[PDB]
Amino acid sequence: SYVAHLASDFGVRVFQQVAQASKDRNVVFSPYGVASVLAMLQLTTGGETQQQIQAAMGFKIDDKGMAPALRHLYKELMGPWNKDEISTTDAIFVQRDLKLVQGFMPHFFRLFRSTVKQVDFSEVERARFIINDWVKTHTKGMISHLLGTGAVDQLTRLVLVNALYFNGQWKTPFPDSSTHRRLFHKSDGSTVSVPMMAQTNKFNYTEFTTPDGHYYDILELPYHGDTLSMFIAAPYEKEVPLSALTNILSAQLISHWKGNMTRLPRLLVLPKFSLETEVDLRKPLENLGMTDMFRQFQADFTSLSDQEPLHVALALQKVKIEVNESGTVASSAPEEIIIDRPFLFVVRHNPTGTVLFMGQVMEP
Amino acid sequence: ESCKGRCTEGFNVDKKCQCDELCSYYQSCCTDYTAEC
Numbered sequence: 050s051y052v053a054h055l056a057s058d059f060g061v062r063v064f065q066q067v068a069q070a071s072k073d074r075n076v077v078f079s080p081y082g083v084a085s086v087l088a089m090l091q092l093t094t095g096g097e098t099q100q101q102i103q104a105a106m107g108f109k110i111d112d113k114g115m116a117p118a119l120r121h122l123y124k125e126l127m128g129p130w131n132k133d134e135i136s137t138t139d140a141i142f143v144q145r146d147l148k149l150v151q152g153f154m155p156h157f158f159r160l161f162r163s164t165v166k167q168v169d170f171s172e173v174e175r176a177r178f179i180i181n182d183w184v185k186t187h188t189k190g191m192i193s194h195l196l197g198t199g200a201v202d203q204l205t206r207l208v209l210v211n212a213l214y215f216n217g218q219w220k221t222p223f224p225d226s227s228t229h230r231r232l233f234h235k236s237d238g239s240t241v242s243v244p245m246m247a248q249t250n251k252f253n254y255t256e257f258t259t260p261d262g263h264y265y266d267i268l269e270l271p272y273h274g275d276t277l278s279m280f281i282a283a284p285y286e287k288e289v290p291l292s293a294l295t296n297i298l299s300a301q302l303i304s305h306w307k308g309n310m311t312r313l314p315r316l317l318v319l320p321k322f323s324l325e326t327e328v329d330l331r332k333p334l335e336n337l338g339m340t341d342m343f344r345q346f347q348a349d350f351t352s353l354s355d356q357e358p359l360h361v362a363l364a365l366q367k368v369k370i371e372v373n374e375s376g377t378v379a380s381s382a383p384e385e386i387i388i389d390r391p392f393l394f395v396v397r398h399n400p401t402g403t404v405l406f407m408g409q410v411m412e413p
Numbered sequence: 414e415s416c417k418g419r420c421t422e423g424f425n426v427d428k429k430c431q432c433d434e435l436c437s438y439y440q441s442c443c444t445d446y447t448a449e450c
Contacts, residue, residue: 145424145435145439146424146426149423153423154421154422154423155421155422158421163434164421164423164433164434165423166433166434166435167423167424167433167434167435168435168438169439179435179438182438183435
């Protein structure tokens with residue numbers, strides 16, 4: 050579907066803004082997640098606030114087929130195949146006693162099969178407990194304490210949250226006994242020791258070039274039953290910064306990564322990692338043109354409430370990803386591909402091409 | 414005092430008990446919230 054691609058493209062553009070402001074830090078992010086919550090926010094907005102979101106996303110949620118295709122994607126990710134591997138939640142919270150526009154909720158429910166949550170921000174500590182507990186119980190206990198003390202206050206009226214957890218189960222797990230500490234070369238020219246997994250398998254391993262003619266390699270690691278894949282991406286030369294690859298690695302490119310005509314055996318060496326990133330979406334969204342939604346008087350959320358002024362006080366995504374030997378609680382020469390320098394990873398939903406997760410690993 | 418066909422309407426200050434997704438946090442759920450919504 051067109052909307053799956055547009056939603057991934059938008060989310061990747063957001064990831065790029067986040068990566069740009071990240072320095073030498075690890076980042077994990079969800080392009081799918083931010084697209085989904087911003088698509089829902091479109092319903093709440095009007096005027097230039099709506100226009101800015103629709104222009105940046107490249108579609109209107111109200112258009113024919115747009116909402117059904119997003120619902121379909123959501124349903125799919127909740128299928129029986131997902132062994133508590135992905136736990137996501139999108140929620141919009143508005144001031145509980147704020148009068149909402151007649152018919153807004155059933156209309157929101159028709160399109161998304163959820164509602165806008167209604168929490169009393171004037172009771173500050175309680176609202177923060179509520180939002181936090183909501184997030185925790187809807188990510189199978191994985192994202193707790195999203196909001197620390199003082200994250201919201203008495204004047205907070207509207208808050209967007211997107212929280213995701215991922216730990217995939219490999220189609221072929223890495224044997225535990227093959228795991229040991231190896232040197233990893235950081236982009237600042239320093240070297241650290243990190244646990245790295247290793248397996249011999251037939252993976253897709255393709256070489257491409259950037260416009261500036263830098264070589265990069267894409268390794269595909271399928272999860273069980275081929276529904277999801279992790280892609281690992283890195284410049285071939287150590288001197289080439291990861292950013293030369295991030296700035297060009299679009300939704301279009303990723304969705305086009307495909308099988309090798311003949312897959313070949315190789316020994317793969319990959320660092321284990323466990324990353325947690327909290328992203329404040331404000332600056333990334335403003336850089337993509339969505340400035341009005343944050344501005345106290347300029348913001349137009351008249352489709353949600355035409356009673357009192359509204360604007361987004363906070364827009365958060367928090368992602369936790371786990372990459373290990375099996376993705377379970379269990380306990381387990383050809384060409385060598387060794388990932389011992391910073392890399393990008395992409396988790397792709399294969400039937401749709403949807404970019405679920407995206408990140409840079411600067412130091413495992 | 415019932416949630417029948419109300420699970421989708423959000424908070425309603427005029428109604429005697431609520432049916433919104435957070436009503437349990439406000440100890441205000443109609444007794445049939447669970448079975449309806």
